[PDB]
Amino acid sequence: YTSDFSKRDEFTNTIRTEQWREQLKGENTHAK
Amino acid sequence: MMTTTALAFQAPDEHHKPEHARKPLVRETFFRKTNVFFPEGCAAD
Amino acid sequence: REVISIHIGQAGIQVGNACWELYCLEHGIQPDGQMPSDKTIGGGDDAFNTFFSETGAGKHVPRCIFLDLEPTVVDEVRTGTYRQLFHPEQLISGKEDAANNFARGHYTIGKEIVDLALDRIRKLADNCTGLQGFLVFNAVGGGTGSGLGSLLLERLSVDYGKKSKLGFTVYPSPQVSTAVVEPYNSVLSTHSLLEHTDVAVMLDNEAIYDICRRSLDIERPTYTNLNRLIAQVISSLTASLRFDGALNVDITEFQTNLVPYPRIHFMLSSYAPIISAEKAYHEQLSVAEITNAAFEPASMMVKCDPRHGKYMACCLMYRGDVVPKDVNASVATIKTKRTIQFVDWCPTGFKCGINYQPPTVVPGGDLAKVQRAVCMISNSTAIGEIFSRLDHKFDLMYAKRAFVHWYVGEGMEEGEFSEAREDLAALEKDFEEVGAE
Amino acid sequence: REVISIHIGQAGIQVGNACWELYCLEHGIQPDGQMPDAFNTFFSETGAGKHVPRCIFLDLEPTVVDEVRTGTYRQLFHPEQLISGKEDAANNFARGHYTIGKEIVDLALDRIRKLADNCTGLQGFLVFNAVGGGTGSGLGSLLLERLSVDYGKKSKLGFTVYPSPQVSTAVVEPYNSVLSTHSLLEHTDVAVMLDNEAIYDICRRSLDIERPTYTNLNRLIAQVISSLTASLRFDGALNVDITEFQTNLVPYPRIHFMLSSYAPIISAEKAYHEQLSVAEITNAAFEPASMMVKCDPRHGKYMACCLMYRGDVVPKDVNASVATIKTKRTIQFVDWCPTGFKCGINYQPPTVVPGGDLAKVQRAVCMISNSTAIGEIFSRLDHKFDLMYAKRAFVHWYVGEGMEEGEFSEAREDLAALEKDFEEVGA
Amino acid sequence: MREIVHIQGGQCGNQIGAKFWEVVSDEHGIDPTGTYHGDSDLQLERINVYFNEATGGRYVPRAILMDLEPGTMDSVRSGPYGQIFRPDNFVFGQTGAGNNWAKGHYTEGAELIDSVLDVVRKEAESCDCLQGFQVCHSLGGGTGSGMGTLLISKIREEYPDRMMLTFSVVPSPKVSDTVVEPYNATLSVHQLVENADECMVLDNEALYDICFRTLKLTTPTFGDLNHLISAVMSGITCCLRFPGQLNADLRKLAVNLIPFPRLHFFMVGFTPLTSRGSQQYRALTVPELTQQMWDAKNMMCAADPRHGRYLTASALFRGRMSTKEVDEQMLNVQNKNSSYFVEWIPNNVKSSVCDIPPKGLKMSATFIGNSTAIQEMFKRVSEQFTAMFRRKAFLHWYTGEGMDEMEFTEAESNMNDLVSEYQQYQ
Amino acid sequence: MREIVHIQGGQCGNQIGAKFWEVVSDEHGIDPTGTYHGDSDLQLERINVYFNEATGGRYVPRAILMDLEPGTMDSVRSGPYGQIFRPDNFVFGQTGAGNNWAKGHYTEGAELIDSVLDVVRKEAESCDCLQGFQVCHSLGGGTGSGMGTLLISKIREEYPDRMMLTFSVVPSPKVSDTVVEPYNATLSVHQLVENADECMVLDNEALYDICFRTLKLTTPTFGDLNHLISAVMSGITCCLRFPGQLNADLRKLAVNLIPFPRLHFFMVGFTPLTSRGSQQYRALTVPELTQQMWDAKNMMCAADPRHGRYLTASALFRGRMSTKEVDEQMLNVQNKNSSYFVEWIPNNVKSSVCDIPPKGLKMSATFIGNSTAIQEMFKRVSEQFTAMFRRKAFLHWYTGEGMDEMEFTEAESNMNDLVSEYQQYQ
Amino acid sequence: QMMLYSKCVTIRDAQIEEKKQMLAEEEEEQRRLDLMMEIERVKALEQYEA
Amino acid sequence: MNNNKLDEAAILAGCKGVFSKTSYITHTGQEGKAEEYEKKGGHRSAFAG
Numbered sequence A: 001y002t003s004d005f006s007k008r009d010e011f012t013n014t015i016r017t018e019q020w021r022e023q024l025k026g027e028n029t030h031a032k
Numbered sequence B: 001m002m003t004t005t006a007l008a009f010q011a012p013d014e015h016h017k018p019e020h021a022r023k024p025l026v027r028e029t030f031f032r033k034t035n036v037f038f039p040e041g042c043a044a045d
Numbered sequence C: 001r002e003v004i005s006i007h008i009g010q011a012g013i014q015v016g017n018a019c020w021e022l023y024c025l026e027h028g029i030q031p032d033g034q035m036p037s038d039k040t041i042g043g044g045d046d047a048f049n050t051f052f053s054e055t056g057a058g059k060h061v062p063r064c065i066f067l068d069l070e071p072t073v074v075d076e077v078r079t080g081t082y083r084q085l086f087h088p089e090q091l092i093s094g095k096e097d098a099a100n101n102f103a104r105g106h107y108t109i110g111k112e113i114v115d116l117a118l119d120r121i122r123k124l125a126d127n128c129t130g131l132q133g134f135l136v137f138n139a140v141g142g143g144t145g146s147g148l149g150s151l152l153l154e155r156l157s158v159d160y161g162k163k164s165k166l167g168f169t170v171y172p173s174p175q176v177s178t179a180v181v182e183p184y185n186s187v188l189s190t191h192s193l194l195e196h197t198d199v200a201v202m203l204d205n206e207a208i209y210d211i212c213r214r215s216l217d218i219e220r221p222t223y224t225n226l227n228r229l230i231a232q233v234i235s236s237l238t239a240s241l242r243f244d245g246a247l248n249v250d251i252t253e254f255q256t257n258l259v260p261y262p263r264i265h266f267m268l269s270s271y272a273p274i275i276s277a278e279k280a281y282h283e284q285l286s287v288a289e290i291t292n293a294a295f296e297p298a299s300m301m302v303k304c305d306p307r308h309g310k311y312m313a314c315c316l317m318y319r320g321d322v323v324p325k326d327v328n329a330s331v332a333t334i335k336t337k338r339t340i341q342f343v344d345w346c347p348t349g350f351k352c353g354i355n356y357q358p359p360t361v362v363p364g365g366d367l368a369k370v371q372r373a374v375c376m377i378s379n380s381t382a383i384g385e386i387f388s389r390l391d392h393k394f395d396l397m398y399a400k401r402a403f404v405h406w407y408v409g410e411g412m413e414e415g416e417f418s419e420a421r422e423d424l425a426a427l428e429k430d431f432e433e434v435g436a437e
Numbered sequence D: 001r002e003v004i005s006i007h008i009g010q011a012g013i014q015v016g017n018a019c020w021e022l023y024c025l026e027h028g029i030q031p032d033g034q035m036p037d038a039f040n041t042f043f044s045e046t047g048a049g050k051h052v053p054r055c056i057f058l059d060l061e062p063t064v065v066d067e068v069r070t071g072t073y074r075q076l077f078h079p080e081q082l083i084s085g086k087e088d089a090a091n092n093f094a095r096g097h098y099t100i101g102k103e104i105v106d107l108a109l110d111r112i113r114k115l116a117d118n119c120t121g122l123q124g125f126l127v128f129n130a131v132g133g134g135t136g137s138g139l140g141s142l143l144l145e146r147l148s149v150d151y152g153k154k155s156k157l158g159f160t161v162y163p164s165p166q167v168s169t170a171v172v173e174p175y176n177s178v179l180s181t182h183s184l185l186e187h188t189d190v191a192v193m194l195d196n197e198a199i200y201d202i203c204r205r206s207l208d209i210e211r212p213t214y215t216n217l218n219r220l221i222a223q224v225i226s227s228l229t230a231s232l233r234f235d236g237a238l239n240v241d242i243t244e245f246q247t248n249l250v251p252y253p254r255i256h257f258m259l260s261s262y263a264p265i266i267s268a269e270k271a272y273h274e275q276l277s278v279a280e281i282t283n284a285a286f287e288p289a290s291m292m293v294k295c296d297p298r299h300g301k302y303m304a305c306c307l308m309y310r311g312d313v314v315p316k317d318v319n320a321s322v323a324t325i326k327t328k329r330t331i332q333f334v335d336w337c338p339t340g341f342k343c344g345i346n347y348q349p350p351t352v353v354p355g356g357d358l359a360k361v362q363r364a365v366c367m368i369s370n371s372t373a374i375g376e377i378f379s380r381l382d383h384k385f386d387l388m389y390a391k392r393a394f395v396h397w398y399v400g401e402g403m404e405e406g407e408f409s410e411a412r413e414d415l416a417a418l419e420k421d422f423e424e425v426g427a
Numbered sequence E, F: 001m002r003e004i005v006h007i008q009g010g011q012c013g014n015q016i017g018a019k020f021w022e023v024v025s026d027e028h029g030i031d032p033t034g035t036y037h038g039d040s041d042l043q044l045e046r047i048n049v050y051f052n053e054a055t056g057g058r059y060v061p062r063a064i065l066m067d068l069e070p071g072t073m074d075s076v077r078s079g080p081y082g083q084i085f086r087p088d089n090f091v092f093g094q095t096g097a098g099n100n101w102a103k104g105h106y107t108e109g110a111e112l113i114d115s116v117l118d119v120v121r122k123e124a125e126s127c128d129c130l131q132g133f134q135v136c137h138s139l140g141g142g143t144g145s146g147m148g149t150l151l152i153s154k155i156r157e158e159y160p161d162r163m164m165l166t167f168s169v170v171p172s173p174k175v176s177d178t179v180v181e182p183y184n185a186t187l188s189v190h191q192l193v194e195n196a197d198e199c200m201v202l203d204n205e206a207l208y209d210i211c212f213r214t215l216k217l218t219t220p221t222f223g224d225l226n227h228l229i230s231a232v233m234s235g236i237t238c239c240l241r242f243p244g245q246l247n248a249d250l251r252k253l254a255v256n257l258i259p260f261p262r263l264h265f266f267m268v269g270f271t272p273l274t275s276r277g278s279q280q281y282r283a284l285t286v287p288e289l290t291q292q293m294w295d296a297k298n299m300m301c302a303a304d305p306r307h308g309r310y311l312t313a314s315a316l317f318r319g320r321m322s323t324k325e326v327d328e329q330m331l332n333v334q335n336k337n338s339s340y341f342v343e344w345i346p347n348n349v350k351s352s353v354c355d356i357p358p359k360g361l362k363m364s365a366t367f368i369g370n371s372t373a374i375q376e377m378f379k380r381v382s383e384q385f386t387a388m389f390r391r392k393a394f395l396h397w398y399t400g401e402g403m404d405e406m407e408f409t410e411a412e413s414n415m416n417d418l419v420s421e422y423q424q425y426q
Numbered sequence G: 001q002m003m004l005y006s007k008c009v010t011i012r013d014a015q016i017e018e019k020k021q022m023l024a025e026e027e028e029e030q031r032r033l034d035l036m037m038e039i040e041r042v043k044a045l046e047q048y049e050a
Numbered sequence H: 001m002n003n004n005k006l007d008e009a010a011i012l013a014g015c016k017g018v019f020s021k022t023s024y025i026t027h028t029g030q031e032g033k034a035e036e037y038e039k040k041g042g043h044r045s046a047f048a049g
């Protein structure tokens, strides 16, 4: 269904993790 | 909790016998339980 | 006139769970097992006798044996709403499943369960008086449904033999499947179903899905509605014995009129009119339209193309408000049509029958109440086409010897695989040979 | 005696929504389907207290058909008979004839046959479509082909809506018309053309309605069809069934194209002031001011004329009027046909519809003729077809569907051959 | 049934779709919390064309956002009707392109086109019958042009049978935001000519002069322009969403408007657009609509149609209108101004009517005219491209990134032969 | 009737089992005090599969804990649902293994395995009809892998006719907990390919990727990962405990999934795993669950199914669902992506439906896929094994205890022929 | 014949009346299930906040 | 099943996807040769004479 480069090691990177944490913060705040 | 087999089959709300059911006239009238001789008058003839 | 019903496997006993509900509803039996009007008090009726027998006073018990190896579905039955109706002893549950393994069902657990099964059947027959025949319910894909089912059939054949054995078996659909080894199971089951069963009726899953989808217009159908419809077709089959009709047939009639050869006994069934209540008012119901519906593959129970093959002999059971005149006219129209072709060598290809009691309706069911109904049971060569299709996917997995280690670890070998393979080859030969003019 | 009606296209089912509405009020049938023998020709009585029309709507877009499903006549039509595809042909003859027809016509034919099996004394079929659209042309051709190989001998009355020359709403409709007539020529038995400009002029002038919609057009066309089939539906002084127009109006196996008209198209107030008789309406049924196809019959010569009469009509004055018409020289018939009339009388007057703009009239006339003005129309269409085709416009759509240049050329030369037939017979 | 999925690219595409989805939601009566509260039962019957029921009357738009800067995400979640989107569809990078077409098509593309193709594939087979796709973007930015460009290419090579709409604003020297506008535009159109099925050319300049003269607006924010483009988009998809006396779906309008495969760039007009001061002194008739429709000052591009010829035109009307008045009005406008049309195609007007007006109006209209005046705008941009390419200015930011020169020459050739055949058919 | 005994080895297996028994106790409705407090009598009918009735309607779990350091036992008894075990079942050493396979398989095994064999014996003949054994452990730790492996050996030598479930995590270079991971993994699987009947391969990083993308947890501690693994284990065994429309026991799943005696390493997955912020925006249908099932990002092993072929697969559904939807859904997935499935095995999908969904959900699904893509994982650990063996690093702590070099030669040879036959059947 | 027909039609009427109520109860039960799921979502949100 | 499919199988139940198409008794769709709706049938000889 989803034709991609395998990306299960995309969140071993601290930078990516903090990026996505920012995204989650934004979603939750806007939801509030 | 509700199972699909249990949910699907419930006691039928109402039941009645079929309009045409085979009736055993043979067994009912031809055979009679136990009496070699009957009282002289039982049926008006 | 009596007939007994045995249900083997996961599928057969659920089908029976539908069938017996339908039967109590047809004979007015409350689920606790007694009529609302007792025998002496109500008018004498013997219609119920063929299925179940009045025990003592005010209690009726079905001539059936459910048997399986997992306890789950069977004690689900034991705790369902039909606790008082079914006989406590008749329900038989093993300890662990065959688990989709023909060998495990036919050699490991059969050797201990089938003796008990044949015991109860024996005393069931002894309680019976005018036994017509047997009827068996199973799916050939499963383990219990194939292995110990066939073993039980073999032992019944050596026990009685001369009596007819109506086997309503579920074959696997071509495209739709839920198991993996079901080609192996189907082959190993049909090897014995060829030379033991007298009259074997095929009931696929895919065709019934398409039926309830198109005609019954239900979008999300489960097994419940399928088994309801199959209960309807079985009731339509046995209504000739149950209720007096204008032109009746018995169990031994399909043995003569339908089976022209000692091994060519594989019947496609169909039912009509399969119609919802909402569209009933718009539709006008006569005999001609349902006589056509009974022949269209839009209403057959096996996914196959009857137009591709040629018919051998057909049987037309009618229930309800039907006179012989218009059905004679309709069968004349069918015989004069040319989109369907009977076999050359058979001039008369019909066995009609009429019964006065119309089909019933169940609360919560999707079928509407109609005047009349048709059950068509035919014989053709599309079944041989089906067997070729099954043999294909069989040999595809057999070439790489997949899944064989489970069987040879149970104790079977390659020899029976090979001989069943060549047996089905000869069987395909037989169907084409018969098709020949 | 029964005859069934199929509707194909976005216009066909709208016409049907007017026609069957007209039929129910003519037979006193409420929209729920039951009255509070004459209906037997259109409805089959399903048991008791219910009548289903012998009809099948068929379309590829679902939005208009399930408007019918949820409209007021949900209780009237059979659920299965309304048949809807999934996506539209989108004004593409190739798409409606090869891409989607291959999938929908099998279902249509097995429905129509079991309808014919339910019928007993089938007179014929009658189809409703417009040759400008994509659905009504492509699968219409495919459907008619498969009906002709199935039955062959039975009548197939085609009431087509042809595209008017100067008023029009499509673009590729010249391609659709040419590709449709190539099969409508040799498959339809009896075909009636119906433009829109002519009905616009009628409602603008006679009905004096300045803002008409499609509803009023369909109401008038339903009135014509009902007046045409009232001979089957009711007994009259002189009955004329479907098979008569087959032999009375078609002199040659390839010239079956009829022009229609109707009179008196009369508003609610003028009729009360005016006096209705037969001589004036026989006159009124011949002027181009009351025809249903924009053309000039004075430039043409009649082949044969057919005249249905409804209401309080005696054969005396209709013979007198047709005499006056035969003696007048304002209209000329063809030389090879000396007696060119086929008339018929029925007692029941044309009814009124609530929401319609016509009042009850004592008598009415429906005329169906045949002339060479239609031969001028086909030439007028083929000119503007070849005008676009000369630059290979819009061809990439059809060939991308799977067709080629061959059927384009052969349909062009077929209309050319058809043109030569009209000028030959008219000579 | 028939299905249109929505795709928004770049900041302009995001805000346009924001107003667009607000309009569609208002038409179908769904609240900003996503529940139905309308009155007409006609609205329920065609919401699958743009939505999916989630759980208990919760409808989510079938839309996918795509950008490269989170500030746009803040903006779309800020306004009302911004909470109804599925957060899984907020597929989104982190770094940013920066009006660099090479960055939108070669570097960040191959890292983001990955995921967007995945969510659009999931969203495509979620529904049953795809009618076509809808993509709204610009041609000045890099996040909009290059991303959408590669997305359109991948979509076309995957699903070639379905229709495709792309609404793209084009840059003009009068309202010229960024500097590399020709460098972006020429390459993007160089891809839309072979990939996209049809494109609706828009421009901010025409939107400005429209709200200056006709609307007499004092403060033309971006909200009102986007409000106008939303009314356009709703007008064109109204045929699917509501039944009409004469219907014309997406593919029907495409085959009616496209005579040749490469001739698929259209211009738009909308009416009634009347000032609120003069909305009391106006009439409601189809000639009242037709005069404001066919006026050259109501086209939403900077291409005067009276400087060229119409090839084909289409008009989608909404409201209870008399069809006879409709076609005679079209016939009159074809008869009187007969020079402005093409000759060898008779009846160059396709018309359709839907019986449901936009909310707040009694009778509305939408004009889509494929004329040849658009070659003026393409010359308008290609001469600036040749001016920059003669000096190779700003070129190395594309060369050193992976793009080469022959791509620029191919864009030049394709633009030049495009306007050559437009001029030929003019 | 049917019986599953539970064996927990090592720290990972102990804590996973702790969460597992919390989940089961919740689904059956027994409090951490050990008393029944559910409401449905459907729970009571099949708790004999996991519990022993005790005086006062208290059901103690049929479990055996096994380790070498008491801290694990304290961590088990500290948390809730910890006071319900039997202290006689806390069979337990005193010294500690310390991530040495030889210490877990030869030194401390020699004096502890007799005791655990006695207690697993007593717990086997405490019941009537065994179904199988269920062991939770790792492949890198010392007291879990080595002792668990030797335990599996003794039990398979004892009861060769019963099923066997091993929930075993595997190491990866990116999640590198200890240093001798290949040294332990190779030998453990080298013994499991002959002893165990089927093995559920798991890994940490795929669970990490799951809780981050699909669950969108910020702080994914071990509690949630062990919660996921417990969810899979409860799902795979829900068929025995609850009635269904199509039942599939442990052996039934085994013969449907294992076409060859050595090809019994499965990847698993669970649905629905949906982020709480987006749970409101989604639907609950069989197509909804299936698209999440066959997602490549939902396998709980770092083995890309797009990089290999499926030999066979199974799907265990829970809840009131339409079986037709189940069949046609699986038929689609096989028809669309026909290239990835193996060709010489038709109908590669086994499906089953149980009527009881887990608490808190409406529909659930457990996916078990036996694909050939896991050869990439085995070569991935075998390469590290060969690299370390090339210079015998960290070997002498294994040599000096009783193990020799040919054991390593046999293990790598068995690994090599395993990946060779996987490659062959691909 | 006509009597048998009329009786069957009456039974049809009763059956349709039954089916409508069946549909009603099914939709009500679905509504209840969705309410339960949303309550669970609210509780999980509260946990996260804590 | 027939998610995006304009085929008869998708249209068969009214725009809902059927597992597989069935040939129709009444007419042979694909073939040019089709079933004759009205076929003259010989009546009893006694009827005419």
Ligand SMILES: Nc1nc2c(ncn2[C@@H]2O[C@H](COP(=O)(O)OP(=O)(O)OP(=O)(O)O)[C@@H](O)[C@H]2O)c(=O)[nH]1
Binding pocket: C008, C009, C010, C011, C012, C014, C015, C070, C097, C098, C099, C100, C101, C139, C140, C141, C142, C143, C144, C145, C146, C170, C172, C178, C179, C182, C205, C223, C224, C226, C227, F245, F246, F247, F252
């Ligand atoms: N018609 C119908 N078929 C069913 C039903 N349940 C299962 N089946 C069919 O049964 C086949 C497999 O055999 P089952 O009866 O399910 O299992 P079994 O025969 O008991 O064999 P084991 O599972 O090994 O015990 C499947 O292919 C299903 O298609 C049902 O309720 N109705």
Ligand SMILES: Nc1nc2c(ncn2[C@@H]2O[C@H](COP(=O)(O)OP(=O)(O)OP(=O)(O)O)[C@@H](O)[C@H]2O)c(=O)[nH]1
Binding pocket: D008, D009, D010, D011, D012, D014, D015, D061, D088, D089, D090, D091, D092, D130, D132, D133, D134, D135, D136, D137, D161, D163, D169, D170, D196, D214, D215, D217, D218, E245, E246, E247, E252
């Ligand atoms: N008389 C009359 N003609 C109509 C009506 N509606 C549409 N038409 C004619 O139909 C022609 C186009 O075909 P449509 O019916 O609109 O659509 P179609 O035939 O299904 O073909 P598609 O557009 O591809 O779906 C136009 O030229 C109209 O003149 C109507 O209500 N009354």
Ligand SMILES: Nc1nc2c(ncn2[C@@H]2O[C@H](COP(=O)(O)OP(=O)(O)O)[C@@H](O)[C@H]2O)c(=O)[nH]1
Binding pocket: E009, E010, E011, E012, E015, E016, E098, E099, E138, E139, E140, E141, E142, E143, E144, E145, E169, E170, E171, E175, E176, E177, E178, E204, E222, E225, E226
């Ligand atoms: N209608 C409209 N156009 C806009 C808006 N913002 C930017 N644009 C146009 O978009 C062009 C620049 O595109 P840009 O915003 O850089 O796209 P992006 O960088 O890919 O997001 C300019 O020519 C503007 O005219 C807006 O809010 N509304």
Ligand SMILES: Nc1nc2c(ncn2[C@@H]2O[C@H](COP(=O)(O)OP(=O)(O)O)[C@@H](O)[C@H]2O)c(=O)[nH]1
Binding pocket: F009, F010, F011, F012, F015, F016, F097, F098, F099, F138, F139, F140, F141, F142, F143, F144, F145, F169, F170, F171, F177, F178, F204, F222, F225, F226
């Ligand atoms: N799921 C899960 N895995 C764990 C946990 N703790 C350790 N592990 C895994 O266990 C593996 C090491 O096994 P280990 O705990 O050392 O086994 P032992 O030393 O024999 O008890 C590592 O790869 C970890 O990923 C936990 O709390 N949860």
Ligand SMILES: [Mg+2]
Binding pocket: C009, C010, C097, C142, C143, C144, C145
């Ligand atoms: Mg079973």
Ligand SMILES: [Mg+2]
Binding pocket: D009, D010, D011, D133, D134, D135
């Ligand atoms: Mg149309």
